[PDB]
Amino acid sequence: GSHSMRYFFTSVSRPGRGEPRFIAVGYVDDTQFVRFDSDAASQRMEPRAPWIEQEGPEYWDQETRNVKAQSQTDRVDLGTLRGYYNQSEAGSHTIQIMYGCDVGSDGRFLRGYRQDAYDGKDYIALNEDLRSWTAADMAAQITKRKWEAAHEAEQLRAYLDGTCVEWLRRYLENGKETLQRTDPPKTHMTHHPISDHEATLRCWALGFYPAEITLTWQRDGEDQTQDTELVETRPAGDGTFQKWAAVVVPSGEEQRYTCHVQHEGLPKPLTLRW
Amino acid sequence: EVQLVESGGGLVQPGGSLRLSCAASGFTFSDYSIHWVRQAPGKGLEWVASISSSSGSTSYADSVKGRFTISADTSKNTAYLQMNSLRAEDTAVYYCARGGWIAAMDYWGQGTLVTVF
């Protein structure tokens, strides 16, 4: 019953083509609910969930102002890190930022996150005690000193356990029929004959929510985890997810394989067979 | 080191204006918030209004919403509280405090007695 609120910020510098492209995305659980694209004509924080469109124009005025401020901070950080790393001024570089919080079933604060990344690699992260930083290289040690002399982990503390935990319960309350639901998987098994002596059994799990699922293609108890495609949970597009797990069972040997599905929307794990 | 001094309130008739000022000294004014808290005579602490020096985010007690406004001259180390349309229920001792990143008012002033007559 644990819930989380995440914010993803991606700033990609485009030298010779304008200002760094900035995209901000927010997610109550696995449900995007806000949005900001710097290339869009609106130039506002936009709602992407039906339960967030009820917030007053003061909420959207503030969200736009606070996301257009991170837009500028990332815009000067791209040129700052480009000098820390001594890189050319005509290359595209990315600054990804991901922060947020995790509350429990009772709405109490569990942990808070704040992680930056420069060019896909980790740059700096906020330690689990929420007062220390982990600088991932020799150019994030300079940032670490700034963020320690400026007490950045102390100003950010009041947001990660008091402003995320409070608005997150506001979101879980407004979107109660959307975010606090568990759709169990629609599981079925498909046999695809690939040869007269070789076959493949696919174990679908469609339309489930949340995305945390587990398909396990056991064989007489001993789980295999090998010779098994287990594609990443993919968005179905309507708030539900999809995922299948195949096995390459020889022909004439199918009715000894079981597929086991574990989902928090399931009363107990399944044992789909053919 | 961190010292808050509030001054500027006293006798006032109802339906008039006062400007309480709180000259902060001992910290970077734009790093913390300044809260105005009043202690009605004999009664308990009442939070009145707030200012975030950076981003200029005000907030009021909803009993002083349209009648009190906080301004904060960052390049004076001072937070003001203009109190228009004063009632006889606005008489109290007004403290300015400092929100110190811990969601608590760690440093307080001494008090400005506003008596509406």
């Binding site: 606070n66 996301v67 991170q70 000067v76 890190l81 300079i142 700034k146 950010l156 608005w167 | 981003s55």
Partner: peptide, 9 residues
């Protein structure tokens, strides 16, 4: 909501 505080590298 989105966080206000930010210092920059």
């Amino acid at each position: 909501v989105v966080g206000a505080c930010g210092v920059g590298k």
